[PDB]
Structure formats: C-alpha cells, structure tokens
UniProtKB/Swiss-Prot annotation:
GO MF terms held by the record: ATP binding; Hsp90 protein binding; identical protein binding; kinase activity; protein serine kinase activity; protein serine/threonine kinase activity
Name used for this protein in its record: Casein kinase II subunit alpha
GO biological process: apoptotic process; chaperone-mediated protein folding; DNA damage response; double-strand break repair; negative regulation of apoptotic signaling pathway; negative regulation of double-strand break repair via homologous recombination; negative regulation of proteasomal ubiquitin-dependent protein catabolic process; negative regulation of signal transduction by p53 class mediator
Segments of this protein annotated with the region Interaction with beta subunit: 35-40
The protein's Enzyme Commission number: 2.7.11.1
SUPFAM superfamilies xref list: Protein kinase-like (PK-like)
Encoding gene, per UniProt annotation: CSNK2A1
Catalytic activity of the protein: L-seryl-[protein] + ATP = O-phospho-L-seryl-[protein] + ADP + H(+); L-threonyl-[protein] + ATP = O-phospho-L-threonyl-[protein] + ADP + H(+)
InterPro entries on file: CK2_alpha, Kinase-like_dom_sf, Prot_kinase_dom, Protein_kinase_ATP_BS, Ser/Thr_kinase_AS
Organism: Homo sapiens (Human)
Tissue: Expressed in gastric carcinoma tissue and the expression gradually increases with the progression of the carcinoma (at protein level).
Places the protein is found: Nucleus
Amino acid sequence: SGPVPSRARVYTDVNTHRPREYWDYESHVVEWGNQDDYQLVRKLGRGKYSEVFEAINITNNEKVVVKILKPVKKKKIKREIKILENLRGGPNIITLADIVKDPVSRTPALVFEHVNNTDFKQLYQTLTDYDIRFYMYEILKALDYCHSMGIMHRDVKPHNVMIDHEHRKLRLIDWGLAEFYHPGQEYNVRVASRYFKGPELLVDYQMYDYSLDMWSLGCMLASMIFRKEPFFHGHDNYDQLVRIAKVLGTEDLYDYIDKYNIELDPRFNDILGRHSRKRWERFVHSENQHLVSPEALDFLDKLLRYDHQSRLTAREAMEHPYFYTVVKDQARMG
Ligand SMILES: O=C(O)c1cccnc1
C-alpha cells in the first residue's frame, strides 16, 4: 500500500523523445554576455532566490530587467536558463535577453525584456469581466505552450504574471521553480507559493504533472472574479488544505486520497474536520457580481478539482465558452 502512480494526460512523453540535451540542463554550457553593457536603475524587489532591478543597456539605452541570482547550486541556475532558452519566443513567455556574471555578487545575473507592468494589487481592483477573460486566455496560451514543450512552471501566481495593461500585454515570468516532466518521476512537493499550492503538494503526492499549474490558475481566477486575493488564505501548508476543504468539501478530498492511496499526514486529523461542498454563489456579493457568470463558474469549477487528472488541460480550457468572445477578438485579419 504505497501511493498509486499517475501520469499526465497530455504531453506525457514529449521529453522522452527529445534529444537528451533539451532536458539535461546539468550539461548546459551557459552563453555569457558582457556585464558592462548594463547598469542597474532601481530595485524592484528581493526574495529567497534573487534581487531584481530595472536596468538599462547602456550601449543602446534600452530598458531591461536584471535578476541577480542569490548563491545556489550551478544546476539550479542551469535549469532556469535552459528552460528560458527552450521556451524563448513562445506565446506570452518572458524573453531572456542576456546572461552575465555580476561582479559585485559573484553570481550570474539574468537579463530580461522590460514589461511596463501595473502591480496586480492595484490592477486587479480595476479589471472588468472582459479583462479577466482576456488575461486568463493569455496565461493559458503560455501554459499550453510550456506544457507542450515538456515543462511545468510550478509557481503560477499574480506576482509571476506581468501585465502592461494599456497594451493588453502579458508575460509569464519567474521560471526558477520550473522543471521538465518525465513520466513516473517523483517530484519535490516544495514548489509554488502557499496560496497556489495544489492539493497534491499539500498531501505530499509526488508523482504530479502539468496539472499542478491548472490548480494555481484556478486559484487566480477565483481571486479575480470574486475580488478576494488570494482566494484560499491558509496560515501554513496544513491550514491551506483546510481552507480548500471548507470550499470543495471533505467528501471529495477523502475520495481523492482513497483513489491514490495517499497516506495523509496525521497532523491533518485534528484540523480538516467535516465540510460540505459549497456552491460558488456563496462567494458572490454586490462588489463582484458583475464579474461572475455561469460560464465563469463552470470554468472555475473544472480547474479547482482535487484530482489532478480531472482538471482541464490548458488546451481544453482555451475551448471553454467563457473565452468565446476573446477568441473571436483575437482572430485578426492583420
Ligand atoms: O523571470 C523573472 O524572475 C523576471 C522576469 C522579468 C521581470 N522580473 C522578474
């Protein structure tokens, strides 16, 4: 009685068949640019894995973003570089422009294209029903692309979606937790950010896949349409699953655990309780009702499922009625 194995329903074997060099990032030899081409202009933020600046290319006065890598294994940096290179040019994928050796930090620095974005804490307050549909669709194009390329993002969240709203321009950023999908691999569950972690991570089911990103995306959609960011606000990873269970219910949670023969951590015992599945209408109120439609709720419901195999894929999600008018709008004659 260990856990039952799982496979991605789509894109299962896309790496199997690639040249080894595509996915074998530990063998990757970095192409270094010239650090003296860039000057830091203003700090944007700083966290566990890097400090991030707006910067300028002083050879041509172009704005860029520089992410100075904190010290980590060479393999971790190679993974992020290789993924960025493999995905470069794909729809809504941030473009890695250069890789340099930062002299002061003694570490590599990644140079990205600049997106003039609006902080999601201000932007989300202003989004219309159409805007949510449009940007959702844009994120789905990036996720279908990366999934189709054999890569899980593993950190989908609002902070990692840059939006230049006047240009209706979106880029999926921060590929530092991303990894290649290989069928049967048991992955590290210490990925994503708490509020966006899928149930698979929270119950310690390691044989997960691209579908993790679809849970995170559902969390983002809930936060948009209901004006509640983040939607599932746990205090820690255990309470995070409790928050989910108070909405999706405990019946379906325990069904999922049974199906995969998961051994549930006993710290859950005193905390998970017994909860009915709630209707999404419980979250509707006068300030969000204009964002909520039957289509939005049907789509959300098909993302936020305990069983990772039963969530929509990105490519299926793009066909949902919620997106009909966005799809029509983007069929441009050129
Ligand atoms: O990928 C990143 O971490 C990144 C990309 C562009 C801008 N800021 C951060």
